[model samples]
Target: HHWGYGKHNGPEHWHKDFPIAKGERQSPVDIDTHTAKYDPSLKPLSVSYDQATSLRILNNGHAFNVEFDDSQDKAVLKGGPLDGTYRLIQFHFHWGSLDGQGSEHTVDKKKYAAELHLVHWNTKYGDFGKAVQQPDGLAVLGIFLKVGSAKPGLQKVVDVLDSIKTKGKSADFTNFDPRGLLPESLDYWTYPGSLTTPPLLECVTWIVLKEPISVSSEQVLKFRKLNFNGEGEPEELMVDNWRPAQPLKNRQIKASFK
Candidate 1:
């Protein structure tokens, strides 16, 4: 499962190892806002996150993730198009070293500076490890990131990236609410897709937000400065850690807003 955002072992080459890379329900589709099905039946998303559950931040060689303690339902994602309560597992971000080509999902064929993914699992499935392989196991909220002024709430997260600059490294990060990283509008597009990484299982309900949050140039630059290798290994810049847009197939994308 050797894969990355680069040419040799990038997304384009993933299909060789993980055949599902070219599967029917792949992720990060280009969302057409006007043509999206407006689901009036879709309830407003109920996002409840507990600050105390915010545990640690780690670099997984691909992106940085802020893990949460999901032993209880304190930090859960409910409502919206989801049937049951899904526990928050972790949140991660993807970006490019350059501009205008970072985000995985795009709007009307347009790209953004970066993207954020808040990954959750269906409690009915027992655990994230169990859910990752099931068709209705996980729900991932996608938030587009654009270049602009520094985000106030995101400062808490950005401050700790330096500690986990190398792959497999982690640092303590507590009391920082991920809800602060969201936009005001809960309006989103929902679809069925697969994980954007290797062993790409066809099991994720994608909830991509309509509005994008602001991020400064220096912040994006900081992410680019991180390394893909761990300590004592050769240093390789962790830039362009985003997958390209995938084919939408015949999946229906429902919108929470008209």
Candidate 2:
């Protein structure tokens, strides 16, 4: 069963079908060159993952919302290269109507198979809400998903998709370490941007990695097969549920060690 329209079908038209669709921040932009006027003096800090780190797994029907107990001290960039400490708040993903594309940040106006966002806030600045106002308050780590060899690390989470296949159905996720999902490369492109969602908060320090990760075709199908309503009930099957890409508006994208 398909819930709403697919992601590539365009978020603008989603409002007609689903009222809530009116408010979302999707991706797809040319963040190549711009000018940087301010520097956050971003520093690198150590990030440690312990068993006690609090975790929350929400089955929103469309995707999984995972929260972790991230430390302000453990957050680091490039093995102590950048000067910034970030606390992981939550991690989520965006998908398309079909299996081919669903991510926000595009490569040369090209959409990827899927997109995952690891949201973090800079403790040096302020809280998440307050940091959303500063130019460098929030740091978002983005990972692009492609079809091919699946990463062993993803199996832990993907393996649970069968447990919660419907909307509003969730299960507790314990003994899970977020570090496993991190891409192998520390290299990233940093930029001053806004939330890819409502209020379009412009206080983000985006760190989009250059490389892409792999997830099996079957795993990708599991995501596409999710129903929005819930299990044992009739509801629309959620196929593509991603926001359309927003405009860069002359914003500059900075890279680390580039």
Candidate 3:
């Protein structure tokens, strides 16, 4: 009904509703490593997370969300292309039905099985509502998910899938450490980008990590079981919910490593 990965309501149709979708700073761009200039000035990203801050998990129809207590600065991100500490608000994933093509951002035109977005909002802008409009108001840590060994961090979210099988379903999910989901190296490519989904605001400062963490093929199958439809409605499994790469325009992608 609304904006979804359907025949008519998907990314191609998004520009019609949200004109900003056609803006120059659109996201999920093809990260051509050859063209990405390594910037020595880019500082290492600093992350301080509290294992206890995770509050709940929800199936919002688009993607499964793990929300946090952004009421205070308990879990925060700073340093890499960020002007100030951005509070961790939530994290979600975009994936494909099959492991071959799922990740939103591609590295040198190569796609991974999925992508994880750790969303943070800048405190200088007050709150998420206001921050979504500023040019440097959001910082999203993009982690690619490759099909390989079982990631215990990812398993934490996968284990709760049954509870939120359908749209609008939610459950209390706490005491989980999100740091477990990150790859060992923070080497990343930074750029100005937008939300890959609807209301495609050109506000995000994307920090896409070069190294991807692992997720077993079986674990990916669980993600496919999630439904876009609500309970009691016709069951429709969610898959291939990623947006394609947009034009790079005049944007410059800076790498933290060569």
Top of the candidates by TM-score: 3
Q: In order, how many clashes per candidate?
A: 0, 23, 0
Using all chains and alpha carbons, the TM-scores for the candidates as numbered come to 0.96, 0.76, 0.98
Worst 10 residues of 2 by lDDT: 20-29
**How does model 1 fare in lDDT?**
0.88
Query: Which residue segments of model 2 deviate by more than 4 Å?
Result: 1-10, 13-28, 33-54, 70-83, 124-127, 231-233
Give the per-residue lDDT digits (tens) of candidate 1, residues 1-258.
Answer: 478777798888999888888889998789988889999999999898754388899999989989999998978888988899999899998888787888999899999989999999999989889999889899999999999988888888877888988999999998888878989999889999988887888889999999999999987888888889888899899988878889888889999987
Q: How much lDDT does each candidate structure score?
A: 0.88, 0.64, 0.93
Q: Flag the better candidate by lDDT, 1 or 3.
A: 3
The TM-score that candidate 1 achieves is 0.96
* Per-residue accuracy of model 2 over 1-258 as CA lDDT, tens digit each: 233344443445544554533333223354453342223454433344443353667777556787666555443333222346677777888887666778878766677888888887778765677777676677678888888877777777787776777877777786777777766775566655666554456566677777788888877877766676677788666655665566655455565544
Model 3 lDDT tens row, 78-165: 9988999899999999999888999999998999999999999999998999999899989999999999999987788899999999
Candidate 3 — what's its lDDT?
0.93
Q: Please report the TM-score between candidate 3 and the true structure.
A: 0.98
Instruction: Report how far residue 223 has shifted in candidate 3, in Å.
Output: 0.5
CA RMSD of all predictions? 1.3, 5.1, 0.9
Lowest lDDT 10-mer window, candidate 1? 46-55
